[PDB]
Symmetry: C2
Subunit: 97 residues, 2 copies
């Protein structure tokens, strides 16, 4: 079954999605994927908080900061689970391959 | 073109390979993928060196220790490039898609 070991396949799947294809990502989803991806691959949020005026960079950093403390494998599992749940919410089933 | 950004896709591809499929991985290749993967995703080698009688665990840790100091993004790129060159050496072309 699917585990954190499928995190890379899930990342590759998200990266492969076309701009206007069958899968749509709202800002919330993009921020969830971004922050879990960074937590999974870099650990806790790095550096200083971006300027408020950089609202997208700041939102990304804040979303990553909201994951501080999460173990890398737990972030990987959460990323995969979120992809699976998002795809189901759009009528799509996924597995690696 | 391909870059470290395709690391996840390359990992997922290697995981997808069946035991006796078109792609064959010798021990050297397995140790290269393992050590670059660990370097890329965890940084420098962790913990104590395994006992020699544990030949495979020792070989894997030693291969990871040989990557110590390598920047994570450089490890990712090296992994992707190694997959591309390994596949070419068996008459296969790969790309994420």
């Amino acid at each position: 079954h699917m585990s954190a070991a499928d995190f890379e396949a899930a990342v590759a799947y998200v990266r492969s999605l076309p701009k206007d294809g069958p899968v749509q990502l709202d800002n919330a989803a993009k921020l969830q994927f971004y922050s879990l991806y960074k937590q999974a691959t870099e650990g806790d949020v790095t550096g200083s908080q971006p300027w408020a005026v950089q609202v997208e960079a700041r939102a990304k950093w804040d979303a990553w900061n909201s994951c501080k403390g999460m173990k890398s494998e737990d972030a990987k599992a959460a990323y995969v689970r979120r992809l699976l749940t998002l795809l189901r919410s759009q009528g799509i089933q996924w597995k690696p391959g």
